[PDB]
Amino acid sequence: SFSGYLKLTDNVYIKNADIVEEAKKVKPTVVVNAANVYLKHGGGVAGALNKATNNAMQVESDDYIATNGPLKVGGSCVLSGHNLAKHCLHVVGPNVNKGEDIQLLKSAYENFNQHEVLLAPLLSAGIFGADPIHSLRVCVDTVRTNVYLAVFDKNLYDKLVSSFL
Numbered sequence: 001s002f003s004g005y006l007k008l009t010d011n012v013y014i015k016n017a018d019i020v021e022e023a024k025k026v027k028p029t030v031v032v033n034a035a036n037v038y039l040k041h042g043g044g045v046a047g048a049l050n051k052a053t054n055n056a057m058q059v060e061s062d063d064y065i066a067t068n069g070p071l072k073v074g075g076s077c078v079l080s081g082h083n084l085a086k087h088c089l090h091v092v093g094p095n096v097n098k099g100e101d102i103q104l105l106k107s108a109y110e111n112f113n114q115h116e117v118l119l120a121p122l123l124s125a126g127i128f129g130a131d132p133i134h135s136l137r138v139c140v141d142t143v144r145t146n147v148y149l150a151v152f153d154k155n156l157y158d159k160l161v162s163s164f165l
């Protein structure tokens, strides 16, 4: 199971780890992808997860979009986890670098409540432009299921733990 995580609350855990390497190691039931509405996994966590699947995640995602159209900001879809997990929950957090409503971050985290346990990144953090301290606070105040957060950046991980209320 998950190892080396610092317990933040009853159900939220955090670790300074590469989510791709964490997924390959644990093979969780659900790995969360920091997706965009088009499921175009170009950069950040999405680009890294997709590259780990040898682009199989992108091929599956393009078929999903061709059939269903784009996701909503704050929404999600469950697709295969390929070589990383049983499932990948593609969750769209608001991208503040694309001028999207930061109030949609709570709606994005609510998708996690449909899964008993998840390996996840901080939504809207990194290249999505939101304050990761704010993302962690929304995560702890919204998610009720067991979430194991992987934070790639050591310096950000330290800042998140040291500032956690």
Ligand SMILES: Cc1ccc(NC(=O)N[C@@H](C)CO)cc1F
Binding pocket: 018, 019, 020, 021, 043, 044, 045, 048, 052, 126, 152
């Ligand atoms: C935000 C973020 C987090 C983790 C990674 N990790 C990654 O690409 N790891 C490779 C070496 C795994 O094969 C990239 C990212 F952009």
